[PDB]
Amino acid sequence: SSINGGIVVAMTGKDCVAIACDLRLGSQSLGVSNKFEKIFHYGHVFLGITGLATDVTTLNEMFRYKTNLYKLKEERAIEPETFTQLVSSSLYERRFGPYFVGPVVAGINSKSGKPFIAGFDLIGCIDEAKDFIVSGTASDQLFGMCESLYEPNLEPEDLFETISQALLNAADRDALSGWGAVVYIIKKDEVVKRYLKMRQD
Amino acid sequence: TSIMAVTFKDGVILGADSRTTTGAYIANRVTDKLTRVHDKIWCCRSGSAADTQAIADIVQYHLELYTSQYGTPSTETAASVFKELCYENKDNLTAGIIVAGYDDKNKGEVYTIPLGGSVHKLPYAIAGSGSTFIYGYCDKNFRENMSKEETVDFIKHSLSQAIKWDGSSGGVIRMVVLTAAGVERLIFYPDEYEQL
Amino acid sequence: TSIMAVTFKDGVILGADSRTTTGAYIANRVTDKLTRVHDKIWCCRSGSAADTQAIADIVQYHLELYTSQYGTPSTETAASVFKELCYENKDNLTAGIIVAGYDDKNKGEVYTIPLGGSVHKLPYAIAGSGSTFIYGYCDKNFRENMSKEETVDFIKHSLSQAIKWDGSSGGVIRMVVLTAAGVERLIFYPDEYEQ
Amino acid sequence: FNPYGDNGGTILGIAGEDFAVLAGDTRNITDYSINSRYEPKVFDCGDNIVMSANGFAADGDALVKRFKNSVKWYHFDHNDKKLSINSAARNIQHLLYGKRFFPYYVHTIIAGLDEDGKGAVYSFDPVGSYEREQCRAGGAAASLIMPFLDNQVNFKNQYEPGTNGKVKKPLKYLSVEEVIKLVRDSFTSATERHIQVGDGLEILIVTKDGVRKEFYELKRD
Amino acid sequence: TQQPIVTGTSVISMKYDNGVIIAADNLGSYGSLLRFNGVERLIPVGDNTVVGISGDISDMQHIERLLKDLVTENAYDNPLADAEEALEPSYIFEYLATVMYQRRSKMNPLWNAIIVAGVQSNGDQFLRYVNLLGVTYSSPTLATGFGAHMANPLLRKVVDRESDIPKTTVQVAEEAIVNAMRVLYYRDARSSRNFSLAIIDKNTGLTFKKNLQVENMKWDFAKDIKGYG
Amino acid sequence: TTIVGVKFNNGVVIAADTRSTQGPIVADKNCAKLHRISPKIWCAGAGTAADTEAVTQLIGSNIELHSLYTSREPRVVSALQMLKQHLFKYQGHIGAYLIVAGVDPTGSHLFSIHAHGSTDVGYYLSLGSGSLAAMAVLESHWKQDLTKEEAIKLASDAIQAGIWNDLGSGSNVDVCVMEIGKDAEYLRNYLTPNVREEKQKSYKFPRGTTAVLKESIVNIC
Amino acid sequence: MDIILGIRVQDSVILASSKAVTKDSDDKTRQLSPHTLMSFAGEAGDTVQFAEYIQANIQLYSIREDYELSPQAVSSFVRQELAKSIRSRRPYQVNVLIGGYDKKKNKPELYQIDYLGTKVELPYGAHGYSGFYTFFLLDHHYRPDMTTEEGLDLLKLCVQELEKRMPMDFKGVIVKIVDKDGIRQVDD
Amino acid sequence: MDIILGIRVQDSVILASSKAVTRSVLKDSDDKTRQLSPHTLMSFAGEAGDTVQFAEYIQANIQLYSIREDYELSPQAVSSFVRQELAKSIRSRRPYQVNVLIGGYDKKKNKPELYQIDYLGTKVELPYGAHGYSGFYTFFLLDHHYRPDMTTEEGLDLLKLCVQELEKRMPMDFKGVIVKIVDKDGIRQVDDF
Amino acid sequence: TTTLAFRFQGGIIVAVDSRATAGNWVASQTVKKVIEINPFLLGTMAGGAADCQFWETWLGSQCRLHELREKERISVAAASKILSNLVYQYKGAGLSMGTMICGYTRKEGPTIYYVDSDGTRLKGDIFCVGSGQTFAYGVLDSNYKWDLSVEDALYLGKRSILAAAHRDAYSGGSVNLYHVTEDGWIYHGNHDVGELFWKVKEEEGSFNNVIG
């Protein structure tokens, strides 16, 4: 882990969520790709994975497999909480052989309508927070920026600015991140994806 | 830990301290190191707590099955079960056990299973980290036949010295007497044995 | 391996065994672990032999100079010299030393100097590998103001137990009595303390 | 034998247009245990120079007392000539490099006014490399403060609205009150997110008038 | 120097409105063997200073000899060596800290944790800490080694901040110290039942209490614990 | 990390803090450590949080199946045996240190379980990094006759001492009371003494501050 | 060690491979499909074993379906194989470049797969330290609408820079071109 | 890494030294030789920094001796001095990791001389020699083609063959070679090799 | 860290970045990696910052003493050899240093020496020492000639630093340029790497792979 770089941050607003990530992929100091997206979505739930890129791709494929089978069997899209439990169980199934990843789940429950964000450790310990979740090689800078900037009950327009500023300023202080950023603003029925202009790229 | 078991005229007497330490910190000060594996067969455990507890539970299960099938097991049978468990898994266990029981053999019986899983039958046995300081004393104040009160006094003096000179031993002194009348449990507090 | 010093009523008696082992093999079956520093004020040493011999020689030379120049040294002076030698070479020597002495004013003094160079007086002292087996017994059978014969019996019993229960300890039992009468040497053979 | 240790502090130096601010937490700890809740690390060394060494407490105290002695001897040997901030920085560099092979396990920040009257902050590394900066945080919470200062002092990654990110937000003069507010917010965030950070904040302000002190309470009182 | 052989135990201390209280046990443990008893670890210096030492006891004796030498040296050519030019806790602590730091810098440390307590000539209570590596700090309550983890939380319940110092009487502080010693004897395997306690008060002076014993212990409930299931 | 259990005349009480950290960084400030094994058998865990959660859930499911099979109320001795055998089988690799309290038709029980598989019985127990301060408080202020209020207050005071004196503990206090003859009472955030206090400034960026390259719409719904 | 480079130009994929094995006529390539080639580098004969295994699987698929796989599917299959390999005993230390022309979309594609199983699909890529000595030129003289001859000249410049500025003598280079007609070898 | 070759003919000594200073490649025109005396030349290889310092120290000592005595040291004396210095350094705190070739022309006997010395202090007088791993590749050619009675041109041709073999065989690219010739007229450097 | 320096008809061009990182975290982005030895000498900082600063200031003091004693400006070779001899004493003690001593003197023209902590000292035309030295050296080698004007040389240095900063994660917070002539050094300002990247991409059609 910590050889490819990458940072993801999720925040909860008023009837909406935001999830942003960097785009750098590299082999230690050398930069390889500036288009390596680390955010995926199944149904209406979004997942960001930091750490080893191979494990990120493997987990994305496995979770797409499981979510498609779930939709076929239950005739219903999976909710963020059930997906969080599934991810935690899958991560714990690899005890002593863990995937070197940091996962973060975001989304709005279709039925209840409230936002939901959560994070996972190496072996699938669920960390549910009502304000923000951070992951990556710049987690300390992300924690500082989120603690300084975040406010409860933010409109999507203000939430986008807050999360973008936090991500950009955290990435500018990390050597293994900052080759482009992408932000998802997720509402009850509409999702907006935006690319950010930043230095070093 | 300081543990001992001595045979006397009416049976056998087991004595133990009540201190369990994690490094230099006393995790438990009311530990009960006297374990019952049959109605009149008891064992004293020293070493790793988890290993000793698991071995005691397995021996208790085996002796219960033996009682259901065959009747009343002898103390030698319990010692043999302990020996098999300790010797088969000597590479992954740290347990020193003293098996004391009263049966038709009379005068009590004491077996010792030290590290390695060996078996030795002795009139009296001492074990634990605190026993090293009370060896010579116990070799100068032991007699083959003694009454109940004299044996209790001997145990109290030996364990008092062991607690005094060993930092890994402390707390209250717990004693178990196995005789034809049954099982008796005795507690001696630091205000009593710190003098005699 | 089993060394002791006791002050009873009229002087001090120091006792020791005579076994020196280079591992499981007994290198010297009968060794004299009691070494004279002065006419009085001399006791036994444990631990490594070479370091103890060097320290004893240095202390003897220093106390010879002290006697020649400033009068007669006390027991505490010898204890202080031993303490300085052990403490300044803390990372270089591993001796362990008990020092026992007699003089008219105090009538028997004992000082214990373990590893690290610390010094303690105590009424009686035990040291060595075998002494670990006699800590309780010596605590249960020591009284102040005993006679010479009672002290000899107590030392004999304690050293016999140490010899029995320690593999690396025990040949014959050597005792030295320092009183106003003089210096007396005593030896006890295995057939005596084993029965 | 390990001749080093960590006491877990956090300091921050910010240079203004005509002032300097050096702030620090007052918690001294070792291995999840709190040695003290009020152990000051920021000292007035004289000549309007304020120095703070963070990390190993003993090495920091030794460096501070050596620098004070050096200032005293400089006053003695040069007819009480005032020591400039750059001269003090070079002297501290020489002091640090004098024991490069047995280095102090500290990070040093000094603050004052330059010969033109503007705020000056100098940062040092353990083996004696120094640079003049405008904002520098040191300690275990430095990674949680510097991005926030970059965003809120240098206005990095900020652009004027309505220009679609074509005109950067211009730099603006900040009074001492704004610097104090930013320092307090950064230290509050560090206290929130760092276990080793936060028992009380001590701030020293250097101007032409002199050095003044302020104190504020943090969590774990 | 490189590793301690005979080691002491926790030393605890706190400040009350008129002075300082410092206590320590009398054990000379040799690892897991309680080899030596009746070892005094509170060294009185002058009529106003008490030094508590924890750790290697040979180094404790070395630095107490150093303190005796310093007291002897302070009286040389000093007509006011007992009125106004006498030693103070601050001077003694500075000398001890300098010695400890110099020993650390040569990679030949004194394996000790030292608490200096006393009353200054102006009536201010002095209580400061030093150890190997030369780390120094001050607090209204101080404790070394094991007592740093158990005695400090209890004492801080009485004196939590500076403003609590004027509100604490000597009786309350002494009761807290005795309770902390009882807890330490409960939970420390290298502790002893006997301890010494020193009180330095601006008015009364130095009061030394030796041969104190831990009492009012609780062991009755242990009769109800049997087995482990 | 500080977990305390205290028995009183009519049941048991368990309490814990709500801080979860990874290294010196505080990850979760309102973590829940009181895990429910059965409706009247509860447990609090220390060490690896994932291991504690997984083992508690597995043992709870097994004990629920056993209760359905035997048509009897579950007993905490069965849970203790299952936990100890599991941990012994895994030889301490599952780093869970548990305090298990419960009420069954045989009475109220309180046990402590270590990672390697050793169990201890007592009237008051403490585990975690702040366990020494909590143990000191328990030794100072415990007696045989305790009502529910006294036990709750003693557990809360021990948790508060662990919070104030241990760097690895903090935030809030959660308390579960068993109280034989009644339903188990869970009190999450029973004490909240660690508020953040208001900041000195508002940090709401103006709209349009961030430069955007491309904006699109995701077909996700 | 060994130099593997690849450039994707507007209607072609150019692959350059070192010819030195520590022999001077080493072909570190395997034709997976008539429109898909793969170059491999890294450790010892494990690379040849992995390449032959992948080639056999792809040939079996083509025989079964009578329809060649797209370059994206081949790259995904290789990435899955490497990801499975790393998580088991005896992993493969193979870094590969896959160049293929998609006939359905009529477009060249280049994929870079690490030994751990990381896939990027760069417009131009390299494996080893050869990226250090070439990526500047590729960052300065590459366009998405370049022709085959311009790509060949750029590759010539990169190879000359590698020869001049690298201490290791890799004994020339062998160049393959993948386009609509298939795979050809440049004899220059 | 560094190729140091030396050959001896009936009336001359030929020395060849590589140009690469790779540590990424910095210089391709390094002259790894020092002129000890107008008839004695030294070629050096080994650890970075040590070689230049040792060569300059030897050159300074030889120049000081020549100025003091108004006489030129024979190649054997210079080789003995260098070997003694290396042997003294081998048991010092910071030994030099330097291997040297000494090429001289004894005017008293009118005869070329070549000496090979390692950092340990082993000195050998050989018709030809090499330092490093170039010996493994050039020893066959030197054993098969060398003759005691050879001219400068034949030696240059043999050196060209050895250099071509090294280029064809060495995995490391030493990027050419610089050749110097020592004879009765002094020291000369050839061009277009 | 790239810290390149090359020679041309107008003298010497020195270009450095300003990024200092510790444990993948960017400690500073305003680090001055050029040391002004005297009004006529410049040095580059690579390896250990403290060693470079301290010993190059010491070298400046030594050069001042030499010019005071000899009433003549010291040559670049003499100062470089003084620094190399000083460093060679401390070899094996853990010093890390890579420096380019660049100077324009009347006798020797423009001269650049490279001196490392291992004791190596060699004169050359173009030098690049750092983590991203390869990209900058490649750019220089592709676009070097002893015919460039001052402006072209400055732009070449900026372009090489930009390439190194883009392709190396440990390099690039700003670009600092210096021009060394026979009358000393001239400082050509500090240029932000982020703005420079966009400016170069807009002017020259390079970096097509980056979306802007």
mmCIF file of C-alpha atoms in Angstrom, chain I:
data_model
loop_
_atom_site.group_PDB
_atom_site.id
_atom_site.type_symbol
_atom_site.label_atom_id
_atom_site.label_comp_id
_atom_site.label_asym_id
_atom_site.label_seq_id
_atom_site.Cartn_x
_atom_site.Cartn_y
_atom_site.Cartn_z
ATOM 1 C CA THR I 1 14.844 18.464 -6.725
ATOM 2 C CA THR I 2 16.362 18.857 -10.199
ATOM 3 C CA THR I 3 18.890 21.724 -9.854
ATOM 4 C CA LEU I 4 20.308 21.888 -13.372
ATOM 5 C CA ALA I 5 23.113 24.112 -14.633
ATOM 6 C CA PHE I 6 24.645 24.500 -18.086
ATOM 7 C CA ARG I 7 27.153 26.640 -19.984
ATOM 8 C CA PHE I 8 26.607 28.694 -23.134
ATOM 9 C CA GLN I 9 28.021 31.677 -25.012
ATOM 10 C CA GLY I 10 26.488 34.179 -22.604
ATOM 11 C CA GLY I 11 27.827 32.408 -19.527
ATOM 12 C CA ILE I 12 26.081 30.001 -17.150
ATOM 13 C CA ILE I 13 22.389 29.255 -16.572
ATOM 14 C CA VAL I 14 21.306 27.736 -13.245
ATOM 15 C CA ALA I 15 17.735 26.541 -12.678
ATOM 16 C CA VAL I 16 16.280 25.014 -9.504
ATOM 17 C CA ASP I 17 12.949 23.995 -8.005
ATOM 18 C CA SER I 18 11.711 24.709 -4.483
ATOM 19 C CA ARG I 19 9.986 21.560 -3.164
ATOM 20 C CA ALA I 20 11.041 19.897 0.100
ATOM 21 C CA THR I 21 9.157 16.820 1.318
ATOM 22 C CA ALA I 22 9.462 14.510 4.328
ATOM 23 C CA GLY I 23 7.732 11.129 4.381
ATOM 24 C CA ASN I 24 5.558 11.819 1.300
ATOM 25 C CA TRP I 25 4.297 15.024 2.969
ATOM 26 C CA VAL I 26 5.351 18.330 1.420
ATOM 27 C CA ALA I 27 7.214 20.146 4.190
ATOM 28 C CA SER I 28 7.752 23.318 2.151
ATOM 29 C CA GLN I 29 7.327 24.735 -1.355
ATOM 30 C CA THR I 30 9.457 27.895 -0.926
ATOM 31 C CA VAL I 31 12.892 26.340 -0.432
ATOM 32 C CA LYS I 32 15.866 28.293 -1.803
ATOM 33 C CA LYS I 33 18.081 25.625 -3.377
ATOM 34 C CA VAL I 34 20.628 28.124 -4.766
ATOM 35 C CA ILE I 35 23.337 29.336 -2.380
ATOM 36 C CA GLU I 36 25.062 32.629 -3.211
ATOM 37 C CA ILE I 37 28.671 31.861 -2.289
ATOM 38 C CA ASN I 38 29.795 35.409 -3.153
ATOM 39 C CA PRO I 39 28.778 38.084 -5.721
ATOM 40 C CA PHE I 40 30.577 35.935 -8.341
ATOM 41 C CA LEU I 41 29.865 32.323 -7.284
ATOM 42 C CA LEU I 42 26.728 30.196 -7.011
ATOM 43 C CA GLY I 43 26.120 26.692 -5.722
ATOM 44 C CA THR I 44 23.299 24.177 -5.924
ATOM 45 C CA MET I 45 21.682 22.368 -2.993
ATOM 46 C CA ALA I 46 21.143 18.612 -3.269
ATOM 47 C CA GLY I 47 21.165 15.908 -0.618
ATOM 48 C CA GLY I 48 21.426 17.420 2.849
ATOM 49 C CA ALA I 49 20.285 21.026 3.053
ATOM 50 C CA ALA I 50 22.203 21.795 6.253
ATOM 51 C CA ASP I 51 25.483 20.392 4.925
ATOM 52 C CA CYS I 52 25.151 22.332 1.669
ATOM 53 C CA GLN I 53 24.306 25.644 3.349
ATOM 54 C CA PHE I 54 26.932 25.364 6.095
ATOM 55 C CA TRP I 55 29.841 24.218 3.946
ATOM 56 C CA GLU I 56 29.065 26.573 1.056
ATOM 57 C CA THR I 57 28.940 29.533 3.450
ATOM 58 C CA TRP I 58 32.269 28.285 4.813
ATOM 59 C CA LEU I 59 33.566 28.124 1.230
ATOM 60 C CA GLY I 60 32.431 31.711 0.704
ATOM 61 C CA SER I 61 34.347 32.788 3.803
ATOM 62 C CA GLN I 62 37.435 30.931 2.560
ATOM 63 C CA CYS I 63 37.159 32.625 -0.843
ATOM 64 C CA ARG I 64 36.845 36.012 0.867
ATOM 65 C CA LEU I 65 40.009 35.286 2.862
ATOM 66 C CA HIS I 66 41.828 34.150 -0.288
ATOM 67 C CA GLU I 67 40.869 37.314 -2.176
ATOM 68 C CA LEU I 68 41.895 39.461 0.800
ATOM 69 C CA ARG I 69 45.307 37.788 1.010
ATOM 70 C CA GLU I 70 46.110 37.511 -2.709
ATOM 71 C CA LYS I 71 44.410 40.732 -3.930
ATOM 72 C CA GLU I 72 42.904 38.669 -6.753
ATOM 73 C CA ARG I 73 39.605 36.889 -7.327
ATOM 74 C CA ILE I 74 39.772 33.139 -6.734
ATOM 75 C CA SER I 75 39.170 30.815 -9.672
ATOM 76 C CA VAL I 76 36.281 28.358 -9.815
ATOM 77 C CA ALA I 77 38.655 25.381 -9.839
ATOM 78 C CA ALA I 78 40.397 26.489 -6.636
ATOM 79 C CA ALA I 79 37.134 26.977 -4.727
ATOM 80 C CA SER I 80 35.723 23.682 -6.010
ATOM 81 C CA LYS I 81 38.870 21.824 -4.958
ATOM 82 C CA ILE I 82 38.822 23.511 -1.539
ATOM 83 C CA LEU I 83 35.247 22.314 -1.043
ATOM 84 C CA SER I 84 36.099 18.814 -2.291
ATOM 85 C CA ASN I 85 39.112 18.539 0.030
ATOM 86 C CA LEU I 86 36.973 19.723 2.945
ATOM 87 C CA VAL I 87 34.272 17.150 2.173
ATOM 88 C CA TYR I 88 36.741 14.285 1.650
ATOM 89 C CA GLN I 89 37.865 14.574 5.285
ATOM 90 C CA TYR I 90 34.329 13.830 6.514
ATOM 91 C CA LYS I 91 33.745 10.848 4.213
ATOM 92 C CA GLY I 92 32.161 7.944 6.059
ATOM 93 C CA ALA I 93 30.652 10.258 8.692
ATOM 94 C CA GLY I 94 27.277 10.452 6.932
ATOM 95 C CA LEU I 95 27.485 13.748 5.040
ATOM 96 C CA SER I 96 25.297 13.930 1.928
ATOM 97 C CA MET I 97 25.975 16.668 -0.615
ATOM 98 C CA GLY I 98 25.767 17.211 -4.357
ATOM 99 C CA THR I 99 26.755 20.672 -5.577
ATOM 100 C CA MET I 100 27.451 22.521 -8.815
ATOM 101 C CA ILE I 101 30.015 25.300 -8.386
ATOM 102 C CA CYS I 102 29.418 27.674 -11.304
ATOM 103 C CA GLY I 103 31.502 30.765 -11.960
ATOM 104 C CA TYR I 104 32.619 33.099 -14.730
ATOM 105 C CA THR I 105 36.238 34.240 -14.462
ATOM 106 C CA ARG I 106 38.423 36.182 -16.875
ATOM 107 C CA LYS I 107 41.098 33.477 -17.106
ATOM 108 C CA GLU I 108 38.895 30.376 -17.365
ATOM 109 C CA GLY I 109 35.707 31.797 -18.886
ATOM 110 C CA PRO I 110 32.522 30.135 -17.650
ATOM 111 C CA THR I 111 33.125 26.999 -15.604
ATOM 112 C CA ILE I 112 30.923 24.422 -13.868
ATOM 113 C CA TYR I 113 32.270 21.822 -11.427
ATOM 114 C CA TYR I 114 30.286 18.985 -9.858
ATOM 115 C CA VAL I 115 31.302 17.937 -6.336
ATOM 116 C CA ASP I 116 29.596 15.198 -4.318
ATOM 117 C CA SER I 117 29.898 13.978 -0.738
ATOM 118 C CA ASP I 118 31.919 10.970 -1.953
ATOM 119 C CA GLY I 119 34.846 13.192 -2.981
ATOM 120 C CA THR I 120 34.232 13.254 -6.737
ATOM 121 C CA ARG I 121 35.031 16.579 -8.422
ATOM 122 C CA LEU I 122 34.680 16.932 -12.188
ATOM 123 C CA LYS I 123 34.392 19.845 -14.616
ATOM 124 C CA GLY I 124 31.636 19.766 -17.203
ATOM 125 C CA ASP I 125 29.278 21.669 -19.480
ATOM 126 C CA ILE I 126 25.811 20.424 -18.439
ATOM 127 C CA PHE I 127 24.808 18.983 -15.065
ATOM 128 C CA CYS I 128 21.517 17.793 -13.571
ATOM 129 C CA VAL I 129 21.466 16.352 -10.042
ATOM 130 C CA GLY I 130 18.264 15.295 -8.325
ATOM 131 C CA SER I 131 15.379 12.868 -8.197
ATOM 132 C CA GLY I 132 14.010 14.146 -11.507
ATOM 133 C CA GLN I 133 17.395 14.780 -13.094
ATOM 134 C CA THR I 134 16.736 12.392 -15.988
ATOM 135 C CA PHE I 135 13.895 14.336 -17.627
ATOM 136 C CA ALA I 136 15.659 17.698 -17.341
ATOM 137 C CA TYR I 137 18.919 16.245 -18.657
ATOM 138 C CA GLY I 138 17.064 14.702 -21.588
ATOM 139 C CA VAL I 139 15.400 18.018 -22.428
ATOM 140 C CA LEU I 140 18.744 19.825 -22.236
ATOM 141 C CA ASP I 141 20.474 17.199 -24.388
ATOM 142 C CA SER I 142 17.692 17.433 -26.969
ATOM 143 C CA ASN I 143 17.802 21.257 -27.073
ATOM 144 C CA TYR I 144 21.416 22.263 -26.369
ATOM 145 C CA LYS I 145 23.912 24.140 -28.542
ATOM 146 C CA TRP I 146 26.751 26.599 -27.968
ATOM 147 C CA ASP I 147 24.813 29.261 -29.886
ATOM 148 C CA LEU I 148 21.783 30.097 -27.725
ATOM 149 C CA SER I 149 20.883 33.608 -26.643
ATOM 150 C CA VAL I 150 20.315 34.520 -22.998
ATOM 151 C CA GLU I 151 16.522 34.479 -23.329
ATOM 152 C CA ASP I 152 16.554 31.119 -25.123
ATOM 153 C CA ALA I 153 18.816 29.630 -22.443
ATOM 154 C CA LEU I 154 16.548 30.915 -19.662
ATOM 155 C CA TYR I 155 13.491 29.454 -21.393
ATOM 156 C CA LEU I 156 15.336 26.154 -21.877
ATOM 157 C CA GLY I 157 16.116 26.016 -18.164
ATOM 158 C CA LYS I 158 12.499 26.783 -17.285
ATOM 159 C CA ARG I 159 11.264 24.097 -19.695
ATOM 160 C CA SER I 160 13.633 21.477 -18.272
ATOM 161 C CA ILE I 161 12.588 22.318 -14.705
ATOM 162 C CA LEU I 162 8.927 22.141 -15.748
ATOM 163 C CA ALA I 163 9.394 18.706 -17.325
ATOM 164 C CA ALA I 164 11.204 17.428 -14.230
ATOM 165 C CA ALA I 165 8.496 18.819 -11.937
ATOM 166 C CA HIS I 166 5.710 17.301 -14.040
ATOM 167 C CA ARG I 167 7.271 13.834 -14.242
ATOM 168 C CA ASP I 168 8.624 13.700 -10.657
ATOM 169 C CA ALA I 169 6.435 13.786 -7.549
ATOM 170 C CA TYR I 170 9.297 15.045 -5.344
ATOM 171 C CA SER I 171 10.087 18.071 -7.537
ATOM 172 C CA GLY I 172 8.435 21.379 -8.312
ATOM 173 C CA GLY I 173 6.875 24.102 -6.223
ATOM 174 C CA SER I 174 8.457 27.001 -8.099
ATOM 175 C CA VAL I 175 11.294 27.702 -10.533
ATOM 176 C CA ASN I 176 14.281 29.900 -9.669
ATOM 177 C CA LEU I 177 16.622 31.082 -12.434
ATOM 178 C CA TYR I 178 20.109 32.581 -12.252
ATOM 179 C CA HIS I 179 22.367 33.898 -15.020
ATOM 180 C CA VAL I 180 26.104 33.933 -14.276
ATOM 181 C CA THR I 181 28.278 36.325 -16.300
ATOM 182 C CA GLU I 182 31.794 37.678 -15.803
ATOM 183 C CA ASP I 183 30.319 40.457 -13.625
ATOM 184 C CA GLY I 184 28.460 38.078 -11.300
ATOM 185 C CA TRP I 185 24.988 36.563 -11.045
ATOM 186 C CA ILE I 186 21.640 38.039 -12.062
ATOM 187 C CA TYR I 187 18.426 36.741 -10.488
ATOM 188 C CA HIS I 188 15.510 36.267 -12.895
ATOM 189 C CA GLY I 189 12.654 35.904 -10.424
ATOM 190 C CA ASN I 190 10.552 33.040 -9.100
ATOM 191 C CA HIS I 191 7.989 31.442 -11.427
ATOM 192 C CA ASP I 192 5.146 29.256 -10.169
ATOM 193 C CA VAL I 193 5.224 25.767 -11.683
ATOM 194 C CA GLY I 194 1.433 25.500 -11.832
ATOM 195 C CA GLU I 195 0.991 28.646 -13.914
ATOM 196 C CA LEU I 196 4.091 27.849 -15.979
ATOM 197 C CA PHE I 197 2.641 24.471 -16.979
ATOM 198 C CA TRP I 198 -0.541 26.047 -18.350
ATOM 199 C CA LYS I 199 1.418 28.831 -20.060
ATOM 200 C CA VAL I 200 3.770 26.375 -21.785
ATOM 201 C CA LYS I 201 0.867 24.124 -22.798
ATOM 202 C CA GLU I 202 -0.976 27.093 -24.310
ATOM 203 C CA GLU I 203 2.047 28.527 -26.138
ATOM 204 C CA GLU I 204 3.705 25.275 -27.230
ATOM 205 C CA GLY I 205 1.390 22.420 -28.126
ATOM 206 C CA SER I 206 3.097 20.095 -25.652
ATOM 207 C CA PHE I 207 1.397 18.044 -22.916
ATOM 208 C CA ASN I 208 -1.519 17.025 -25.131
ATOM 209 C CA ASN I 209 -2.186 14.087 -22.790
ATOM 210 C CA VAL I 210 -3.215 16.540 -20.033
ATOM 211 C CA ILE I 211 -6.764 17.894 -20.219
ATOM 212 C CA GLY I 212 -6.999 21.661 -19.814
#
